[PDB]
Design a protein around this ligand. Sequence first.
Ligand SMILES: [Zn+2]
Ligand SMILES: [Zn+2]
Length: 63
Amino acid sequence: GSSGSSGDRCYNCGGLDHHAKECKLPPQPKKCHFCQSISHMVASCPLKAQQGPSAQGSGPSSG
Ligand SMILES: [Zn+2]
Ligand SMILES: [Zn+2]
């Protein structure tokens, strides 16, 4: 049917043309927008820069 979004724009400066990600400006001092790690930021977040391009089954288990 006819569905859409309320309007998702760059939650940093307010750019509609570009996306928050593409945006260049520095990310607000808010909490990490990756792992909700209020401690560190998304710029330092280690997980973000995870090492290992290998994406062939990652320990397939439950619980
Ligand atoms: Zn922006
Ligand atoms: Zn993080």
